[PDB]
Amino acid sequence: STGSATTTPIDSLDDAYITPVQIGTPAQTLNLDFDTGSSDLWVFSSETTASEVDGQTIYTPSKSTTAKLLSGATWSISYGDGSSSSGDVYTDTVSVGGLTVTGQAVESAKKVSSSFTEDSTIDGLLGLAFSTLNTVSPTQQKTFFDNAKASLDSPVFTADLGYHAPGTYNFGFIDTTAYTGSITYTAVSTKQGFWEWTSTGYAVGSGTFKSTSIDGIADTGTTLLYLPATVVSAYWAQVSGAKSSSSVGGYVFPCSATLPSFTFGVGSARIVIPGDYIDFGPISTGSSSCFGGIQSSAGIGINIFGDVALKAAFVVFNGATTPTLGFASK
Ligand SMILES: NCc1ccc(C(F)(F)F)cc1
Ligand SMILES: NCc1ccc(C(F)(F)F)cc1
Numbered sequence: 001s002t003g004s005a006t007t008t009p010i011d012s013l014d015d016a017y018i019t020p021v022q023i024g025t026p027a028q029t030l031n032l033d034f035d036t037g038s039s040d041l042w043v044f045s046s047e048t049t050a051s052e053v054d055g056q057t058i059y060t061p062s063k064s065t066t067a068k069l070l071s072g073a074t075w076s077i078s079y080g081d082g083s084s085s086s087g088d089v090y091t092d093t094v095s096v097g098g099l100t101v102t103g104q105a106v107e108s109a110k111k112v113s114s115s116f117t118e119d120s121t122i123d124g125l126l127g128l129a130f131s132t133l134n135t136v137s138p139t140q141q142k143t144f145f146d147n148a149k150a151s152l153d154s155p156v157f158t159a160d161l162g163y164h165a166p167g168t169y170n171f172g173f174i175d176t177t178a179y180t181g182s183i184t185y186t187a188v189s190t191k192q193g194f195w196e197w198t199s200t201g202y203a204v205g206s207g208t209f210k211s212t213s214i215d216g217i218a219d220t221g222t223t224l225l226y227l228p229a230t231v232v233s234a235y236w237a238q239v240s241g242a243k244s245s246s247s248v249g250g251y252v253f254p255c256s257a258t259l260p261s262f263t264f265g266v267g268s269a270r271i272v273i274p275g276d277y278i279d280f281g282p283i284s285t286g287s288s289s290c291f292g293g294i295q296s297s298a299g300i301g302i303n304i305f306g307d308v309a310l311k312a313a314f315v316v317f318n319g320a321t322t323p324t325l326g327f328a329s330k
Helices: 144-151 229-236
Strands: 003-009 017-023 028-035 041-043 068-078 084-096 099-112 124-127 156-160 167-171 184-187 196-204 210-218 225-227 243-245 250-254 262-266 269-273 279-282 289-292 294-296 303-305 313-318 324-329
Touching: 003 084, 028 041, 041 084, 068 099, 099 144, 184 196, 196 229, 210 225, 229 250, 229 294, 250 294, 269 324
Parallel strands: 028 124, 041 099, 210 303, 225 294
Antiparallel strands: 003 017, 003 167, 017 028, 017 084, 041 124, 068 084, 084 099, 156 167, 156 313, 184 324, 196 210, 196 262, 225 303, 243 250, 250 289, 262 269, 279 289, 313 324
């Protein structure tokens, strides 16, 4: 079987993408952030502290005839940005675009950090990294993808994120009408639990392609592109007036400038990120300084191919026994 769902940017900057997901019987529809950088399906719920909820749709297990409390199980997660949440665990039926999984672990948030409370458009996360990163204790739980793998026609899902426009998450099949040319596949290391791969190099604008290995993760749950300091310096050196700002915490540039494109290598193929994709607008309302979509990974410890890069391509997450990542222009 297969599944297909539309994903929609939450704001005018493509800061995140939400996808409707049906939980429980009868269905309770929540808009979740599909995150290939984590492995927990957690939701705002009727158990979440009342002061920590500001407009989100909540999951109510007491109204679901298929929800079962997973006795003794707890979860606690901390994200690379300092976000955090925790609670208990239910099992319930979960459907994504027609694709249904029974007995999926649904982690009910009892406490959420402020960054989640202030985001009224995101009702929770659906993790799509490898199940070894799941935080449920004492019994680790499988992701939605891992539980659906056996029933899928093909053990793959694809991300087709839009630039200021809706996109598509497909489960179980590859839409050959959604990309141009061929798909270039590259090896994935699962040793850290991520969709970790190695890019073959980069180029800035119309400049020479620099062949160099960049190890990083494909993360739909991260907004920006985080690359080594040498690469990021070479990019912003081509933008007049650009500078790294300690008070802002990243590279900023004059909003009147035009940004060059950024190319990254996938094997022998090249994915081109248009310069417009790197513009994330004024650092504050009315400011003439704009925030850059390519930032240094030095403070993070790992390079992250976030939405800025991924939305420039059709991306195949091949969860075969030897997992691979496929990239294609679109
Ligand atoms: N999108 C989930 C995520 C967030 C942060 C990280 C970090 F910081 F650990 F790399 C990995 C995955
Ligand atoms: N990378 C996972 C993630 C996704 C969204 C958020 C936000 F936007 F809610 F802060 C935090 C962490």
